[PDB]
Amino acid sequence: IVGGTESSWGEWPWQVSLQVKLTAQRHLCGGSLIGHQWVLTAAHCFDGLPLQDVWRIYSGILELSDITKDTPFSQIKEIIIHQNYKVSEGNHDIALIKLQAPLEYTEFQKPISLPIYTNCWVTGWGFSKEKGEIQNILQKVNIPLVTNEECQKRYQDYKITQRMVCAGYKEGGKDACKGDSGGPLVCKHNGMWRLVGITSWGEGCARREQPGVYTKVAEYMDWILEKTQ
Ligand SMILES: N#Cc1cccc([C@@H](NCC2CC2)c2ccc(F)c(NC(=O)c3cc(C(F)(F)F)nn3-c3cccc(CN)c3)c2)c1
């Protein structure tokens, strides 16, 4: 997150860290807890995939530095990458993770509701600048959506589809960045947070007139419901 501030304990209880344990353990992506056994993330977060075991999913956490062996984590039972996801294109950037064991809901660990907006927040432990590093304390930033027309105007080299939503400022300075991928874009509807986007990509981070591009969750609701039951 570029241009954001430190989150507080319990503030974003659906935010998870998707980490890989090889020799060292590292955070690769965010995700959003959407049910007791279900995490929603970006398909591109699995572009290294075939490496067997080695995924640990952390929920109810604020600070990556306070992860020890004592820190509980979830394990992956199943990954469902959208059928139309292609590594070479940037389309359909969405995946579900079935956890091996259900997580309980608490004030620290609970799901974002699923189903045009200024009051939107992007969160994660990604870079706070393009030549950046993974952040310790979960960052938050308030960013308005832009129309698809406006976003497409900014990205002549790419196809911005009806299944994408964009968020950014004309003069940049606030954006998601590398390592935020797969985490939430939430917006306030009628006193309640809804998952509007999944952090996907952009031309760098926080550049003027280069907004963040998100997977538009509303356009995948049939696929999310079908795959989860
Ligand atoms: N349609 C389409 C399409 C076609 C080809 C490539 C891409 C896209 N990569 C594959 C998509 C996700 C599956 C793409 C295109 C152009 C780009 F410049 C990038 N780059 C990034 O994204 C990117 C680079 C960096 C960093 F600077 F840190 F290295 N961070 N980031 C990033 C990471 C997260 C958020 C955002 C939103 N500021 C940015 C990514 C998209």
Q: CB count, 10 Å around CB of 212?
A: 29
* Chain centroid, CA 168 distance in Å: 16
The structure was resolved to a resolution in Å of 2.1
Q: What is the DSSP string of 37-61?
A: TEEEE-GGGGTTTT--S-EEEE-S-
Work out the burial of residue 229: count CB atoms within 10 Å of its CB; fewer than 13 is exposed, 13-18 middle, 19 or more buried.
Answer: exposed
- Check if 164 has its Cβ closer than 6 Å to any atom of ligand 1: no
- Check if 167 has its Cβ closer than 6 Å to any atom of ligand 1: no
Residue located via tokens 């952040």: 135
Q: Specify the 3-state DSSP secondary structure of 16.
A: strand
- Smallest CA-to-CA distance from 203 within 90, 123, 43 is with 90
Could you give all domains of the chain from N- to C-terminal order, each with its CATH number? 15-109 (2.40.10.10), 112-218 (2.40.10.10)
d(CA 66, CA 98): 25
Which residues are known to be catalytic? 44, 93, 181
* Chain centroid, CA 97 distance in Å: 13
Burial string for 39-72 (b: 16+ CB within 10 Å, else e) reads: bbbbbbbbeeeeeeeebbbbbbbbebeebeeeee
> What are the φ/ψ torsions at residue 95 (nearest 5 degrees)?
-150, 145
Q: Specify the 3-state DSSP secondary structure of 15.
A: strand
Could you identify the atom of ligand 1 that is nearest to the CA of residue 127?
28
- Smallest CA-to-CA distance from 97 within 194, 28, 10 is with 28
> Is residue 125 within 8 Å of 75, Cβ to Cβ?
no
- Smallest CA-to-CA distance from 17 within 136, 128, 148 is with 136
Find the discontinuities in the chain where C to next N exceeds 2.5 angstroms and give the residue preceding each. Answer: 115
Question: 89 C-alpha to center of ligand 1: Å?
Answer: 11
- Check if 180 has its Cβ closer than 6 Å to any atom of ligand 1: yes
How far is CA 50 from each of CA 17, 21, 26, 27, 47, rounded to the nearest angstrom? 19, 14, 17, 17, 9
Could you identify the atom of ligand 1 that is nearest to the CA of residue 203?
18
For β-strands 164-167 and 76-81, DSSP reports them as unpaired
- Check if 201 has its Cβ closer than 6 Å to any atom of ligand 1: yes
- Smallest CA-to-CA distance from 151 within 193, 90, 96 is with 90
Q: What is the DSSP string of 150-211?
A: HHHHH-TTS---TTEEEE--TT---B--TT-TT-EEEEEETTEEEEEEEEEE-SSSS-TT--
How far is CA 155 from each of CA 139, 151, 161, 207, rounded to the nearest angstrom? 26, 6, 11, 13
* Residue 34 tokens, joined: 């959407």
Work out the burial of residue 25: count CB atoms within 10 Å of its CB; fewer than 13 is exposed, 13-18 middle, 19 or more buried.
Answer: middle
